[PDB]
Paper text:
NS3 contains the typical structural features of a superfamily 2 (SF2) helicase, including the conserved sequence motifs for ATP hydrolysis and RNA recognition. Two additional domains contribute to NS3 function, i.e., domain 3, which contains additional motifs for RNA binding and unwinding, and an N-terminally appended protease domain, which enhances helicase activity via a large, positively charged patch that contributes to high-affinity RNA binding.
The overall JFH-1 NS3-4A structure is composed of four globular domains arranged in a tetrahedral fashion, as observed previously for gt1b NS3-4A. The twist in the β hairpin propagates into a displacement of D2, altering its position by about 8.7 Å relative to the location of D2 in gt1b structures. Most importantly, the displacement of D2 drives it closer to the protease domain, creating a more narrow, concave area of positively charged residues between D2 and the protease domain. The shifted position of D2 prevents the formation of H bonds between Arg393, Gly554, and Glu555 in JFH-1 NS3-4A and frees the cleft to form a known set of interactions with the backbone of single-stranded RNA.
Numbering used by the authors: -15 to -2, 1 to 181, 185 to 631
Write the structure that this text describes.
Amino acid sequence: GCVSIIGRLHVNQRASITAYAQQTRGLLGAIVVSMTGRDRTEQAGEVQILSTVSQSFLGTTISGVLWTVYHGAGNKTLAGLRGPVTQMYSSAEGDLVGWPSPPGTKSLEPCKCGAVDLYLVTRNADVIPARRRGDKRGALLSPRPISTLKGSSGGPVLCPRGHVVGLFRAAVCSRGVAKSIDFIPVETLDVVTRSSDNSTPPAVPQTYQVGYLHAPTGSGKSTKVPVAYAAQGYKVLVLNPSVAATLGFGAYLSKAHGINPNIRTGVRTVMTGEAITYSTYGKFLADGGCASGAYDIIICDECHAVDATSILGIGTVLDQAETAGVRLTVLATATPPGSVTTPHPDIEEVGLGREGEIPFYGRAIPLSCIKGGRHLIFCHSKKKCDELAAALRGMGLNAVAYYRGLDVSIIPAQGDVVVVATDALMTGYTGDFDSVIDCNVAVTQAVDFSLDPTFTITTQTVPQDAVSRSQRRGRTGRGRQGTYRYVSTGERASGMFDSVVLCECYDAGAAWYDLTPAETTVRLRAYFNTPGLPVCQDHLEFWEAVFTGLTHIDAHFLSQTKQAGENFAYLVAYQATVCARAKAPPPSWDAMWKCLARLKPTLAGPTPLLYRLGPITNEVTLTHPGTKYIATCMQADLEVMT
Ligand SMILES: [Mg+2]
Ligand SMILES: [Mg+2]
Ligand SMILES: [Zn+2]
């Protein structure tokens, strides 16, 4: 996972800027350099064309530092003369990354003459003129298709004298037309060049503050630390994403410390009067958020969690805490952004070799590892799960596949078994195993602003990050020894998540907590405004607008889509109510649309399509005012990362 250089730009003064582009390395070279992390060849130019094999982007060297965007390079090293080169600067919040610039490269100078005329140099050596709009943007003289600007993030935005005004990072669009340019000002680069240690619990301040606790899981941050706070006379609230963890901590304190704390969950609530409360983020929200004068300290545990409820809970805390009388909010996680996973007690970790009986993502599984006992194998796709469970059964093993669409009772409670599953198991299941085998491949949700007619919710296959890695291997060694086998080390904990998550929050907020869109915004704003958390593109105003227009949802449909656990229960249920009210069928007849089963014989004609949540089987009309509303929301200036 190294970044390699596959080309370069020469940027000099004669529009007065001239640029020349030069491809220098193909796909074989990029893969090899990327895998070895070694590049022995000479370097040159003011801008570098960078590659992660799949995708490509730019980097500009200024003051001996090769700068580029975080949304392209992440936490990756740069291939170098001697081997991998680690980042010298890194800010997900600034969407910025920097390495020491390879020798042979030339620097551009920052602009200190405050020009209005701006010039973007693309990956193809095109110079695009613009005019400055405030601090981080420019209005293009000639609007252009957004497609022409993709792959050029990290390129320089120049003044008429050739100094760098900023780094191109995104386009501001009007339904696919790029009207303006968004960039990282050079002034941001200076600030970043000046910057640690959260290892131990923050002290309780005299006035409200947010603090941080970065320590391993089970280390006691969820048990010992609350007790230490309470023993000083404070009332403590501990929030976790899962029911099992919440219940688990309560039971521990009882059995081990002889302390019986309060427990609040949807499935079980126990109030004892103690000064320590354990709750889920979900139950915390359903309870109305922060109650006045109830707690001195709120600990937001597992704050690397980017599921909708976790984000809403955390953002609610950060918005309401101070006013409710809290002295200290603690944001606690083992895997903060940019961090690696570290070994965990009792869990042996052993990379897979190339020898065995069952091929597995470029490695092999020996039968010995899984014959006898209970084992969990993570596969990236339904298709692969079925294939593998089949192959194992033909070798005399009790193997069984699990993915979304199947029940969890398919998994025997005891006796020998090999479960081969997707991440669907995480939400769907609770129990654990004697070992985990991990393909280290992650499938994540993404939104595509596709304009066919509006937005599409689809997926992405990416290398596993530290958070994912921890979750999967956490499925073994619960209370006792476990074993974790893997194909590769992943990437460091991601500092950035997709816009589709925002969509998920507004959906969940409305579906599960009756939150108004304007109110969901306030809470997400708190989340964004707090440093040290994962960041996102600011599409809050966009998503607020579209959900505001989705009025008068059929309650019965919303109920069923909720039972069925649809990640976007509200968007689905809503699509179903327009179809029903139109006497039209759903876009397909996937299980997604169960709720419309009984009415099938009564529906016909084209479906009024609002957005795409999956494949389309039936004829569709783009006519519904619901479609036109969402579509006109997308005409408003929308920042698209490039
Ligand atoms: Mg603990
Ligand atoms: Mg943790
Ligand atoms: Zn200048």
